[PDB]
Structure formats: structure tokens, C-alpha cells
Amino acid sequence: GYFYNSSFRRYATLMGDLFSNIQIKRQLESGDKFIRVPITYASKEHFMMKLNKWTSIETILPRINLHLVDFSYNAPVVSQYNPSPIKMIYELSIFTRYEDDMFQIVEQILPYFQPHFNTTMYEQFGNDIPFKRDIKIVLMSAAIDEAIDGRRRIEWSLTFEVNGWMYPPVDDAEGLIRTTYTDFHANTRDLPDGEGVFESVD
Amino acid sequence: GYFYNSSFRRYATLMGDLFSNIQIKRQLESGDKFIRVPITYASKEHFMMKLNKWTSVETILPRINLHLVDFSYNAPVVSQYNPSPIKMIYELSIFTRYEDDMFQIVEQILPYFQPHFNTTMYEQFGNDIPFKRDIKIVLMSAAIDEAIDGRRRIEWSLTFEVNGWMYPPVDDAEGLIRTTYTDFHANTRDLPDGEGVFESVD
Amino acid sequence: GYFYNSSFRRYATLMGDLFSNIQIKRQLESGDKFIRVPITYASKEHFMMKLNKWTSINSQEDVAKVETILPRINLHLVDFSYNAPVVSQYNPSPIKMIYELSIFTRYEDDMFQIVEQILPYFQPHFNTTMYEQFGNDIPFKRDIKIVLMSAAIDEAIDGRRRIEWSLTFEVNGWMYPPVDDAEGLIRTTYTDFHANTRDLPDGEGVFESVD
Amino acid sequence: GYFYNSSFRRYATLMGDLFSNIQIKRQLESGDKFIRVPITYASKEHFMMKLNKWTSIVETILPRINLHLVDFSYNAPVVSQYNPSPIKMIYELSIFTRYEDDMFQIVEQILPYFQPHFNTTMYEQFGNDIPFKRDIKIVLMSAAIDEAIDGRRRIEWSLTFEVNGWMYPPVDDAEGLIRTTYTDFHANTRDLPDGEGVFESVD
Amino acid sequence: GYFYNSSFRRYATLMGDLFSNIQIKRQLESGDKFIRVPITYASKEHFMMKLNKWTSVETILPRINLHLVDFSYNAPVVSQYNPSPIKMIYELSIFTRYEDDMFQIVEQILPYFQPHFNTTMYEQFGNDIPFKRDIKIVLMSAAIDEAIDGRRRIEWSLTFEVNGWMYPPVDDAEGLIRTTYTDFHANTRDLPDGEGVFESVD
Amino acid sequence: GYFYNSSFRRYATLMGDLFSNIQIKRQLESGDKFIRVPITYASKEHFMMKLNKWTSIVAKVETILPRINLHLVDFSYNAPVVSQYNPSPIKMIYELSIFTRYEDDMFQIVEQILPYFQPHFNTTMYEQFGNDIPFKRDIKIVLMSAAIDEAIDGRRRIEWSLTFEVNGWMYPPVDDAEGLIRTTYTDFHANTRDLPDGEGVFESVD
């Protein structure tokens, strides 16, 4: 029930999945439980709305919300592999009850972007030789903010530039596109379906 | 009931028609239904007004609204073919219920502008040898925004610079102007009447 | 009842008159109706005030009498300065005046026609040679560059309602201290958009009274 | 009851007096009427306040000019006074008018003399010593055009001028009053009047 | 009950502790008493909130509030010692009843930053040879403001750039990290626990 | 009951004292009365608050003005083994703010300030600790900008603000107990005056 081979979708998923498996420690009398930070893809406004809904009277925070915010042509015979160098901007937004949690989270993200982070993405159509796509992801800025009622809620937003590739729709009917990529430790993971990565904000 | 030979009109139609035939897939139980995105030419404010009227109905979105937003002299014996190098700015505005639809639409637009897209337009007066006009259309910027009540509505706006040609009114009575152009796949289509391309916002 | 020999006035009139004779076609059952776009000289705010007054429907007598108001053009001076390239007046002082030409229209079509009659002559400038003669002396030759600086596009709504485009022009002209009307009226000619030597009319000839 | 020898005051008066004697023609049945535009020195806000006071129900009030100092600074090109300090003062000359016509007349009398500057040689003499010669460049910096409405109503143009002048510490009135002359717009040596001579009282 | 080995935490504590031991003289009939200015780590807004709560007495001011406000990659095989050059921004905010107190406080801070101040930080993991980390702290700006009801309250804020090092979380369980550093007089003090430095704003 | 040897304080006093002795003439029937313009050190907002308090009427509204209010508004390191004489080149910003009932008064006041700053004004400050050889400190004070504004109810009140950059020296607190610091400086006519206590220069805004 969606354009599976969407280039855009593939990038939202790739970025979501790099940040899909981040945990935070939380010492317990019985022992150290680690919780995975759930990640959503939604406009930030929408997310904050729903977050204030969910918030009205600690299992909800911490959480990450990713979203595309801008794109453009990437100024360095026909069009698609050879494809078009595009540049997408993402806003990764971390929400947290405690400064501690925030520190853990970012300390897991930040050190890999110097200021960039490379990943090699292999995307294969049906059964042809896969295409090799070189993806530079650059950490552009950080933005720090609070929100109060009484503790209440800490928000940090990282802005990332993904330097990727775009090309006209290749129908799902004409075969689904298999995708792999190198994670933060250069480990070739395979890009999961969208439903695998993002929690439903709905 | 309008200046048919209007230069401006010819450009609004040219741009409208490049984006006139865009569809989105929509998986059914019975099977994949494809729908053509209808396109209008109207001031953005006017269009949003009428859209909120119509909205008060998933047959309405997705839709595209095109409109001229600026122009100027294009700084690289009389005046008209040899004509005057003019530069027109258009705001192409896509409105959508689902992120998916949006992704499909843009993925059909974006990859052809690197950052420009050339088209050769042939305009012929009555029966003389047609004039050859070289038209550079440049994708300048993108702008992303939402709107909510409850889902509700996604808006992306591309801004395009059309580098075209202007010249004083050549009366309809003195013969109508036949127009052709190369589409996104360098296919010589012939520019339809205005009524053919744009749905009436009225 | 006004300083006829006003340099400023001469420029307002020159600009008014370049844009004085613009028409739009208007297809009928009977046949094509051509209408001249009336032009006024007034501050833009004042003009819009009066336009909202005129456009308002107070009697049925109005209703009909209202698409007779648009289209129309409103010209006005908005800025000036010294034009950085023994006494003072012919030889005169190089001045630079800025004018805002403002087109108001019910239909996009009308607008397209109007501008397509203005725009193509400014690349980005348009030259005119103005001859101004005092009494009966040999006339002065004044070289006038008019440059189209910018365009600005905007709408206004109630229900259709009203389209506004504003061109901004730089007139590169000449200034000099008041030469009294009593000392002889100044005859003025100029080359129009097709290099045709028309003679600059009185002010009352060019602009409709906004009053 | 004021520091007569004030340098500042001397400049406010010089500028006021350059624009002190401007008239406008006004055609009548009987015949042409000339009227001198009255000029005041006051903060613009104050002047507009008092102007709306005077305006409340009016044609003997406009046209009029209001001059005022708006800024100054050191003028980057053994002790301190003649030889004095090169200062730069900014003045806002503000013309208010009922009719566009009046405005046109007024400015057409001001504007053509500033290309973009206008020089004046000011002679200031202390008691009876040899007078000091001071070279004064006045530059027309900008113009600003605006309206105001109720019904016609009122047109406002403001010229901004840079006066390049000279400053030095207070020379007491008691130690002798300072005689001042200057070249007007036609290089005519007029003598700078008292302040009360130039400006109409806004009070 | 917190990530002890947090890099971020280590820097908040280092900065807190440089400014932890500032006093002001206050001449008495019985003789000069010196009071240590208490220091907190909290968002400035939060701190001002709580400060107005506490204020509604002269035992509360003077006080300093420190907080992180921004960070970024510091543009001069894996990642962590060798670590990533990061740059953190801190807002040190002094609140005072009397101009005098303020003068004393800043005169103790300001002269050491010309415009920078170096410190050598030794961080040792368990028992390995310690790591040597060179830390440049730069005084970026100062900001002066008042607040009134009647005297009432003086606020000055110094903005500091800490040029430090970042690396992915090293678990507390894998051994706590011993930290020392050179203070303002090049004296090797050892970085205390967080609870030692900052007064609880809670 | 303060840090007497405060570097900051020393500069606030130096600046206050350069502008401490400014008068205006005021012609009378008997004869010309001169009045010294009182000077305060306080945040501008605070000063205007208190000034509106004092100004709330009848006929003790003219003994209040004219007056000057000085205040520090910014500082920074002055980019041209330990730290203190040799000290650290600092740069302080001061806002000198003149309030006046009559344009005349204002003219007199500024005409006494303005001509000495071209655009700077140098002063040599000698600061001596106890009885050692005094330190020589070269102080450039630069007039940065002027700002002109009014305020009305009916006349009412004229405000001009000069912004000055003092290029001075900073160093860590030298305790009052370890000996008070004697300070002299060259005034506007290069006359070596000695910097008074703070209480001598500024009227209490309190």
C-alpha cells in the first residue's frame, strides 16, 4: 500500500535505521536494564502535537523523531542510473526527560560524524548486478531547547545533510529493490522495510 | 475570450503541460489504480481558499497548483523576434494527503532538473518558418510545510526559473500561434490550449 | 493653478504619457471591444483607499458601474537622489527619480495584455530624447534613460477579486531651479516607445483626476 | 537666556537660514500670491504632535519645514580650539505640504544646489580679532517620501543632510559674542541671524 | 543512577569545577567573612524560574549557573581514543544583588582567558596508562543585563568555547574513569564527582 | 563594605570623574549661576525608573535635571609568565547618558565633552600599590557613537547617549587588606588629578 521503490522512502529508512538501534542504560535494584529509543518519521509539529496528547495525564520518553526538511540539486544520456546527485536535509529530534538520557543518546550519535560519515549503499534491482551508491552524510548543526510544566522535557535537534542519488520511479511491479548499507561500524546490514524501522506515530 | 497569443499565457501553459501528465499508483484489492494529478493556475492564496472550501473528500487531493510569482529582464533594430530575453519565476505547489503520494509525484519531477532542464520550443506564426526558442528551466528551491486538523494536508513547493522570451502583443486576428516543445524525454509534443491543460479553479 | 514649469511635474507627465495610451482587447458577441487603461498620479495608499471606495457597492446603480473601474494604472514618485556618474541650470544637475507604476486588474488576461505592451521595451533600459524649449530659444536636448528595476506581484480577495502588479522604474533625468511660468512656458517633446516624436501634453491631458 | 556662542546652535541656525527664505507661488484671481515657508527647529515627533494639535478643525499652517539634528560623530578624514575638531552633524529637513504642487516648488528650490554636496565658507569672528575661516561641506545624503490621510490630507518629504563642520569647547558669551557670516546658495555673503530671527517658535 | 563515564558529563563537571571555588569578601564588624559562590547546572530558563520561586533571601545570591548551549564538530581506523575533536559552548551566568559582588566574581574569572585558557586533562580508564587530552577553553563573549522590582538583581553571562574530545560510551561496568586537570594556576586537581561540584537546583 | 581595589570599580570611577565636573551657565536677573551636572552609576533602566519616580510632580522637577548617568554595558579581551602586572589588555564599553530639560543645557554639556575625543582621548593613569614604584597604565578612551532621543508629556525630557570604548587593563583581585591602591590620571587638559573614592564622584541613585 505504498511506493516501495521510492528513492525518498529509501533514504528516510536508511537514516531511520542508522539511528534505529540506540539504547540507554537505566540502573535497577535488580540490575542494569537497557531500553531502545523508539524512532518515528513525521513532521516535527505533528509529532509534538501527538506527544503532548500522549503526555497528558515515562514510558513515552525518550524518543527520536526524524523528518525531511529540505532538498536541492547537488552541484558538485538520459536520467536514471546514471542518476541525479541530490542533497536531502533531515532533522533528527531527540526528546528526553533527563539530561542523562540525552547525554547517552548523543554520545552514541555524535562521534561518528567528523563532520561527515560515509556509507556505501548497495541497491539491487531484481537480480542484476547491484548498484553501488556512495552516500556522504554530514552533521550540519545542533539546536538545544527546553519545555516546562512544574520538570519537564528536553529537546535536542541534529540537522543532517544526506548526499544521495535520485532517479524516476521504478515500478514495484517491475521488481522490488534489495538494499544494503554499511552502518556506523562499517558493518554491512540490510536496509529493513519501513515498517520495521519506524514506530507508527498513528 | 482571451489574448491567445499572449507570451505569458504561452509560458504558463508550457509549464503547466510539462507537469500536466503526472500520475500516482494506488494499490487496490482489485488492483493498482493510477490517478492523474489535476493541475490549476491560480494565485496560491486563492487556491488555498478554494481548497479549504472544497475540503469542508479524498477525490480532491492530490493536486498541483502552478503560478507566476516574479519576472525581470534577463541580463546575460526594434523589439520582437528578435525578442527580449526575459526571466519568469513560477511556484509549483503540490498538495497531498499522504507522504507516499508526495514522494511519487516529486520523484517524477525532480530528477529531470540538474539543476536545469532544457526544452526547445517551436512557435510558428500562421505559416511562416517557425521560430526556434531555447528555454532553460531551472529548479531554484524547494519548500516543505504541513497543515493539520485532527490528518491532514501536506504541501511542498518547488520554485522554478524559466528563462524565456518576450515580445509585444501579436494580435489573435493576425493569425494564431502554433506551439510545440520537447518534453522531459525530449519528445516533441505540441502545446495544447490553456483549457486543455489546467483544471478550472472556478 | 500650478507651477507649470516644474521639472518634477514634467517627469511625472513624461512617464504618465509613455504609459498613457495602453489598451486591452475584450471579445464580444458583437465583437472585440478595445479599452484604454486610464492612468492616475497619486500616492499608492491614497489610490487604494479611493479604489476601495469606488469598488464598493452602495446602490444597484453601482453593481453594473464597477467593472468599469478596472483595469487601471497608478503612477507615483517614490524616491530620488543625486546621480553620481559655472552655476546651476542648463547646464543642469543629473538627478535620478524612482517611479512605482502600479497595474490593477480584474483578470489575469487583462494584466498579461497590459504588461506585454510595457515590458518588452525595457532591456533593461529604454532611451528617450526629450526636447524642452523655453519660449523661442534653441531647444535643449535632454537624454533620458529609463530603467525597469523590479517587478512585484500581489493579489487581493473578497469572494474574485483584484490583481496588482507593480513595476519600479528608474528615470535618469535632469533637475534645475524653478524657471517662472511668467518668464515663458516650456514646450516639451519626446521620443515614445517607437522612437516617434510626440509632444508632451499638459498634466490634465494625461492623468485622470483621482479627485 | 541661552548659550549664544554654542557651536551646535550656530550650525542649527546656519542650516535653518539656508532654508529660511523659500517661497511658493499661489495663483489667485486678483493675482499670484507668494508665501514664505516658515521653518521650525524641534524633534520631529514633537513637531508632528503640535502639528496635529494645530490641524484639529487649516491652510495657513501648511506648508512648513521642520529642521532637526539627528546624529553626529567625529569626522575621520597642541590643545583643542581653533585649531578645532572636525565634526560631522546629521540634520533631518522635513517638509510638510497640503499639495504635491507646493512640495515640487519647495524641493525644486532646494535640490539642485546639492551635487551631491554644497560648499559654504563661514566666517566667524570673536569680538574684534581677525575672523576665522571655516570651510563647510553640506551633503544631501538621502530623501524619504511619505503620506498621511484623513478623508486629503498631508504630504511629507524628508531630506537628510550631512554637515561637515567644526567643534570646540564653550567660549563664554561674557567673553564676547561671535559674529557669523556665510555664503548662501548663490555664493552671496549673508550674515547669520540670531536664532530667534530664523526659526518660528514651535512653542 | 547515571552514565558516570559520559564525556558530556565530564566536561560539564570540568567547567563547573574550574568555577566551583570562587569567593567574595563581605567586611563585618567582627571581620571579613568570605562566601563561596554556589554553582548549578541547569537550563538558564529553568534556573531563573526556580530563582524567582526562591526569591519571593540574601542568602540566595550571589550564584552562578552554568549550562551547555551548543556544540559541533571541530574542524581544525575506528573512533574512540583516537577520539573525535568536538567543540562545546557553555553559558556561565552570574547573578548578584550588588555590582560589588559582580566585580569581585568576574575579576576572579576574566583575567585567565587571553582570550583562551589551556588545561591538560588526564583521564585514566581503570589502570591503563592515562590519556592526555589538551583542552583549550576560549572566552567568546560577555552579556550584561539587569532585573528590577523596587533593587533588584544583576545578571552577567560569559560565553565559553570548550575545545574538547568526544567518543562513544564506555560502560560504567567496564570501569570508572579517573580524571585530573590543571586548574587556573596550573595546579593538578582531580575532577570530583558531579554531586561534589554542583548544588542541586532540585 | 566593598572591594576597593576592584579594577572595574577603578574604571567606573575614572570615567565618572572625567565627566564629574561639568557645569552649565544659567542667566539670572542678579547674574549668571553655574550648576554642576550630578553624575550617577546605575543601569540605564534603573536610572530611568528612579528618574520617573523623582519627576512625578511640582517645581522640584527642575532641580533634578540636567543629569548624567554612566554605566558599563559590555567588555571583551582586547586583541591588539603569569597574569597581573604584567596584566591583561581588556576593553570596556560605557554608556554615558545625558538627560536635560532644555536643548540649550544639552548643547553646553556636550560641547564640553565632544571636542576632546578625536575620535580618541588618551590618559596616563598611575596606580601605586602601598609604596612600591607606581605602575604606568596607558588608557585610550574612544568615543564610539552618539544616540539621540526625546520623551514627552505635555515639555518634557531630552536624552543623548554617548558610547565610549575604554581600552584598559585587568588583573586578578589584589586584596584591600594587602594595601589600598593610590590612583592618579591626566584629565582632559593633561592635568594630573588624583582619582577620588567612588563615593566622591557619583551621587547615590539610592
Swiss-Prot record, chains B, E:
Keyword annotations of the record: Late protein, Virion
Gene Ontology annotations for the cellular component aspect, listed alphabetically: virion component
Subcellular location: Virion
Main location: virion
Any Pfam family hit: T4-gp15_tss
Entry annotated with the keyword Coiled coil: no
Listed InterPro entries: T4-gp15_tss (IPR031997), T4-gp15_tss_sf (IPR038553)
Assembly behavior: Hexamer. Interacts with gp3 and gp18 on the bottom part of the hexamer. Interacts with gp13 and gp14 on the top part of the hexamer.
Purpose of the protein: Stabilizes the tail sheath structure and acts as a connector between the end of tail and the portal vertex of the capsid.
Name assigned to this protein: Tail completion protein gp15
Organism whose genome encodes this protein: Enterobacteria phage T4 (Bacteriophage T4)
Gene (UniProt): 15
Swiss-Prot record, chain C:
InterPro entries: T4-gp15_tss, T4-gp15_tss_sf
Annotated transmembrane regions: none
Keywords for this protein: Late protein, Virion
Cited function: Stabilizes the tail sheath structure and acts as a connector between the end of tail and the portal vertex of the capsid.
Cellular compartments annotated: Virion
Protein's UniProt name: Tail completion protein gp15
Coiled coil residues, start to end: none
